[PDB]
Amino acid sequence: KPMVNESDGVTHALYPQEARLRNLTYSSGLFVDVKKR
Amino acid sequence: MIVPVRCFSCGKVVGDKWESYLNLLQEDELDEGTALSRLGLKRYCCRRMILTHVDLIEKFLRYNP
Amino acid sequence: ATLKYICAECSSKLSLSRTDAVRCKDCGHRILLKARTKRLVQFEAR
Ligand SMILES: [Zn+2]
Ligand SMILES: [Zn+2]
């Protein structure tokens, strides 16, 4: 789910309202299980 | 978005009649057309004034700080 | 007695200056507004 990975800070769970004000991008994480072989 | 103090077109105050009107409605269970009439709102200018107002403010209040 | 800022959610007066970041005491919500003026403003009434 959407989140703000800002530096000098953890990672807030971003809500639209804030992205709007702060000029951020209501986006989220793309994870994929790679296989090393 | 609050009740219009006084009617645009003619002048009669209407600032107060809101609560009254909203009451002769849900309680005394009358129909709008009449409720207005009860409230002294004869001619349609002052009449459309109350009958059409959308009291948005009530939502505006449901916000926070 | 005197204020400088405020929090969007936890509407609580702050007051700061350069260096101390721009967050709040308790909830991060790093926004903050800027509280009215002391010199009251006047309005025509028409
Ligand atoms: Zn009228
Ligand atoms: Zn705060």
Side-chain angles (χ1 to χ4, degrees):
Chain A
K1 276 201 171 189
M3 266 182 268
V4 180
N5 180 42
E6 58 203 273
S7 57
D8 336 320
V10 281
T11 294
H12 185 8
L14 186 52
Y15 278 64
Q17 193 42 30
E18 186 183 321
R20 308 234 253 275
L21 288 119
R22 307 187 61 196
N23 280 163
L24 301 167
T25 322
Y26 196 58
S27 74
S28 45
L30 287 66
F31 293 172
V32 182
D33 309 294
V34 188
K35 296 205 74 174
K36 46 189 179 182
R37 65 172 183 176
Chain B
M1 190 59 84
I2 289 295
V3 188
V5 181
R6 328 195 50 160
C7 154
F8 300 144
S9 308
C10 73
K12 164 148 299 308
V13 187
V14 178
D16 31 40
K17 287 83 156 174
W18 184 244
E19 301 178 90
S20 296
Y21 173 87
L22 213 47
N23 233 73
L24 328 195
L25 279 197
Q26 228 251 32
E27 290 202 310
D28 304 53
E29 286 179 297
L30 298 70
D31 57 348
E32 308 89 339
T34 58
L36 304 177
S37 287
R38 186 131 305 146
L39 298 168
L41 315 186
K42 190 205 178 185
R43 44 174 180 276
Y44 51 106
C45 63
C46 319
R47 175 162 270 272
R48 59 87 198 270
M49 207 58 74
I50 280 302
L51 172 61
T52 292
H53 168 203
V54 170
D55 207 57
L56 299 172
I57 174 171
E58 282 303 314
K59 313 215 174 210
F60 287 159
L61 282 151
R62 204 155 153 181
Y63 278 95
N64 202 52
Chain C
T2 291
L3 45 166
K4 280 172 189 170
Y5 298 159
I6 290 182
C7 178
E9 286 68 61
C10 62
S11 50
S12 57
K13 304 179 184 185
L14 263 70
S15 167
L16 302 178
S17 52
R18 283 157 284 189
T19 292
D20 43 289
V22 199
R23 279 207 179 69
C24 196
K25 335 304 175 181
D26 213 320
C27 52
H29 294 312
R30 340 149 197 53
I31 48 275
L32 291 179
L33 308 204
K34 205 222 171 177
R36 205 182 187 69
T37 318
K38 259 69 174 175
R39 36 169 148 173
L40 79 136
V41 285
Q42 174 182 309
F43 295 88
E44 342 79 50
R46 304 107 168 300

